[PDB]
């Protein structure tokens, strides 16, 4: 059933045995039984084999052991019984084996240890007791063992350690007690453990720093974390000089002694986080083997200048969330690699601060108040790969010896507007720059976060030559025909009717829109091929604000004056005394256009979204601050006069419309309003586009029709008027008569 190794070794795995195997050679040396179904051990089960050395009973459910069953095994060395179903430590059947070496009792639900247990074992060296349900340390059975080396009691339910627990263990080397529920430690609990090297107390509920550790003279590695320790008194580590590793994290530490960490001749790393009230740098005299130093969350304001004159082998350095104001020189250091200084009050950089660090790779100085950086700062600094400096008021950024850089982030430095030289950064992989136009110099595989897409072009503002000539065309004739029509309507020395003065104001508003378009065309013509250079200055200056205000103002006056024109016509027909009434209404509407245009100016960043200074296209996120409001006002008005004119259609018949000159005026107004409706639908649709997730159009296209479909009325309204109202011809003859009389 079980194979024979030939060297006196017998192995049994999952062969369904409920009793001890028999018939094997009496000279076998090692016996393993695992995964079978033995539940009880009969008396004199192992009397057959007198030369057994190592004994494995793994995984089966043994529950009862006869006291005399284990007798006769005087040479047994290793005994393993884990994951079985014993409930108490077998004080009997164990006293016989004098020459036992290692004993493993894991995963067995054990609650009580008999007093006379572990008696007669004179040379036991390893004893494993974890994952059980122990509730108090077996002081007497432990004292019974004088030659124990390694002790593990983990995951048990111990609550407190009484005094003089481990007096008689002279040669104990390592002690593991983690995940227990210890909360109090006596001052003399650990006496006698002179040769203890490793001490583990993790995840316990310690509420105050223990003192008994000062009795240990040769404690190498010490680990406690996730506890509730909050205060580190000075002189704590005085007793034990040699400490390679100190584990502490997740503790809610508040105060740490000035001289606590002093005179540790062999400590390797030091980490302190969350210690808020500590405000003065620790005294590190005598510690000359510190690879890594980390202090976070404190109130430190200054740094000693002998720091790495002492620390000759420091490799990394991080100091963030402090109140550091000035930086002492780091010239002495040679092995320093990574430096992090964030959320501090640094405001200037000097040449000498970073001089002499040969092997510095990663440098971070983010979220500070630095505004002055010397040109020669970074000049003789060695090969540096990743440099991050952002969210600081910075005016000019030098570049000397940065050719080896790979990662460079500068975002939030709105004061920085100078372009970036492409030749210097030869091996740059990832950029972050505050304004998208700067990346146009690289024209990128370089990665620049800012989108620098169509809405923010590099070479031409208007893009296509056809679009350029088209806007040039409507600009011109809008201007010329608007001037002609206003001269015809106003220069005549005749009484001015309400409708005539109304169309005059229409002409004035359309003229304003036209020279807004003209100023845009002038900018495009001037900045041909090099828009990237001028973009930042143009958007930041007041010109963009002026242009946007002009456009917005021109577009509201036209709409409101048209609405007032068609109710003027409606009630004029109806009374067929409101002339002065409507004149000041027109004035009041002009004032409203003025204030509506100037309202966004007091806000921040509303007019700088696009180089065109028109907010209605918006962008990635215009987040409808007032765009939705404006389109709502425009649509509601249009539907109002749509209803008004439908009512007029119902009231007055078509034959009277054909035979009435006032109705010819009505037809002209109807043409005007219909044109205004269809030419304003597209911009409203574009503003509604981001609200719907399904619809998406390329910035190429939305820019083109936003450019084309905005100013058309300023062009066709005067053309419509002169082409289809002989009223203009009559005024033309009148002004010809006046000119002939003058000349």
């Amino acid at each position, epitope marked *: 059933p079980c194979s024979c190794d030939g060297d006196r070794r017998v192995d049994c795995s999952g062969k369904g045995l409920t009793a001890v195997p028999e018939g094997l050679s009496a000279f076998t040396q090692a016996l393993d039984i*695992s*995964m079978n179904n033995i539940t009880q051990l009969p008396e004199d089960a192992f009397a057959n084999f007198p030369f057994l050395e190592e004994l494995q009973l*793994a*995984g089966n459910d043994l529950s009862f052991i006869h006291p005399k069953a284990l007798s006769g095994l005087k040479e047994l060395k290793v005994l393993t019984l*884990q*994951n079985n179903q014993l409930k108490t430590v077998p004080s009997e059947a164990i006293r016989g084996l004098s020459a036992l070496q*290692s004993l493993r009792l*894991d*995963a067995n639900h054990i609650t009580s240890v008999p007093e006379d247990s572990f008696e007669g074992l004179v040379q036991l060296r*390893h004893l*494993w007791l974890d994952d059980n349900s122990l509730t108090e340390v077996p002081v007497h059975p432990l004292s019974n063992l004088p030659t124990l*080396q*390694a002790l593990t009691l*983990a995951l048990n339910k111990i609550s407190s350690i009484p005094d003089f627990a481990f007096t008689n263990l002279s040669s104990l*080397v*390592v002690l*593991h007690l*983690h*995940n227990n529920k210890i909360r109090s430690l006596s001052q003399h609990c650990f006496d006698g453990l002179d040769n203890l090297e*490793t001490l*583990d107390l*993790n995840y316990n509920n310690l509420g105050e720093f223990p003192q008994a550790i000062k009795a240990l003279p040769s404690l190498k*590695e010490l*680990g406690f*974390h*996730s506890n509730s320790i909050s205060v580190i008194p000075d002189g704590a580590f005085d007793g034990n000089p040699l400490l390679r*590793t100190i*584990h502490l*994290y997740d503790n809610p530490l508040s105060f740490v002694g000035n001289s606590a960490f002093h005179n540790l001749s062999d400590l390797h790393s030091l980490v302190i986080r969350g210690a808020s009230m500590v405000q003065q740098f620790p005294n590190l005299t005598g510690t000359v083997h510190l690879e890594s130093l980390t202090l976070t969350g404190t109130k430190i304001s200054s740094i000693p200048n002998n720091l790495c004159q002492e620390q000759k082998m420091l490799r990394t350095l991080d100091l963030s969330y402090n109140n550091i104001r000035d930086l002492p020189s780091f010239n002495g250091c040679h092995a320093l690699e990574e430096i992090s200084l964030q959320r501090n009050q640094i405001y200037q950089i000097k040449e000498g601060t970073f001089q002499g660090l040969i092997s510095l790779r990663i440098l971070d100085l983010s979220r500070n108040l630095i505004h002055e950086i010397h040109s020669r700062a970074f000049a003789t600094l060695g090969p540096i790969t990743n440099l991050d400096v952002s969210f600081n008021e910075l005016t000019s950024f030098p570049t000397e010896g940065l050719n080896g850089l790979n990662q460079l982030k500068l975002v939030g430095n709105f004061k920085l507007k100078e372009a970036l030289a492409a030749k210097d950064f030869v091996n740059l992989r990832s950029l972050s720059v505050p304004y998208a136009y700067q990346c146009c110099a690289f024209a990128g595989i370089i990665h620049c976060t800012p989108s620098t897409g169509a809405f923010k072009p590099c070479e031409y503002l208007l893009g296509s030559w056809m679009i350029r000539l088209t806007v040039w065309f409507i600009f011109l004739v809008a201007l010329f025909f608007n001037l002609l029509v206003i001269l015809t309507t106003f220069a005549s020395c005749t009484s001015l009717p309400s409708s005539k003065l109304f169309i005059g104001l229409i002409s004035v508003s359309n003229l304003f829109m036209g020279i807004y378009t003209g100023i845009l065309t002038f900018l495009d013509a001037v900045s041909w091929g090099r828009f990237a250079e001028f973009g930042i200055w143009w958007e930041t200056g007041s010109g963009c604000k002026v242009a946007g205000f002009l456009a917005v103002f021109s577009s509201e006056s036209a709409i409101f004056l048209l609405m007032l024109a068609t109710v003027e016509r409606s009630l004029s027909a109806k009374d067929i005394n409101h002339l002065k009434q409507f004149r000041v209404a027109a004035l009041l509407a002009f004032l409203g256009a003025t204030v509506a245009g100037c309202f966004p100016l007091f806000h921040r960043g509303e007019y700088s979204a696009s180089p065109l200074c028109l907010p209605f296209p918006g962008g990635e996120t215009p987040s409808l601050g007032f765009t939705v409001t404006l389109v709502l006002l425009n649509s509601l008005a249009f539907l109002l006069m749509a209803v008004i004119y439908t009512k007029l259609y119902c009231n007055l018949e078509k034959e009277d419309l054909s035979e009435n000159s006032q109705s010819s005026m009505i037809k002209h107004v109807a043409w005007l309003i219909f044109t205004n409706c269809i030419f304003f639908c597209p911009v409203a649709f574009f503003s509604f586009a981001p609200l719907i997730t399904a619809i998406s159009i390329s910035p190429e296209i939305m820019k083109s029709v936003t450019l084309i479909f905005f100013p058309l009325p300023a062009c066709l309204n005067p053309v419509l008027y002169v082409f289809f109202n002989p009223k203009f011809k009559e005024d033309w003859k009148l002004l010809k008569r006046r000119v002939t009389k003058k000349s």
Partner: nanobody
Framework: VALAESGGGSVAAGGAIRLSCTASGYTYSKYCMGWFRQAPGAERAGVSGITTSPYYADSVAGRFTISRDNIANTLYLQMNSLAPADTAMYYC????????????????????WGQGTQVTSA
């Protein structure tokens, strides 16, 4: 004390592989073990580890299983659907103190190291 590993070799992409490590001794803490990956020209990195919620690396998430059997004191790591970037040398590391997940991205804490194996994926 002594650590030994078995497994490894050359496998076409998308295969499955099992790596088994055995340990002998008593000083090590059975609640801190890890598998470490090394590619030439770079320092060791921690692929996976057992802590007391196993710690898994960013990259190998969803394709790597780590298990421990204290019945026979063996550590198992099974991989499936490998990518060629997984071709490297593998180590088993055991500590002397209990450890958390935060201790696994720094190898210097671990002390007991194995001889290692080599696995290549095509």
């Amino acid at each position: 004390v002594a650590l030994a590993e078995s497994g490894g070799g050359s496998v076409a992409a998308g295969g499955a592989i099992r790596l088994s490590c055995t340990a002998s001794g008593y000083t090590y803490s059975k609640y801190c073990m890890g598998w470490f990956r090394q590619a030439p020209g770079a320092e060791r990195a921690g692929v996976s580890g057992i802590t007391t919620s196993p710690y898994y690396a960013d990259s190998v998430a969803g394709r790597f299983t780590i298990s421990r059997d204290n019945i026979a004191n063996t550590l198992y790591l099974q991989m499936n659907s490998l990518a060629p970037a997984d071709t490297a040398m593998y180590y088993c590391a055991a500590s002397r103190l209990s450890c958390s997940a935060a201790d696994f991205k720094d190898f210097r804490n671990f002390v007991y190291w194995g001889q290692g194996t080599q696995v290549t994926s095509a």
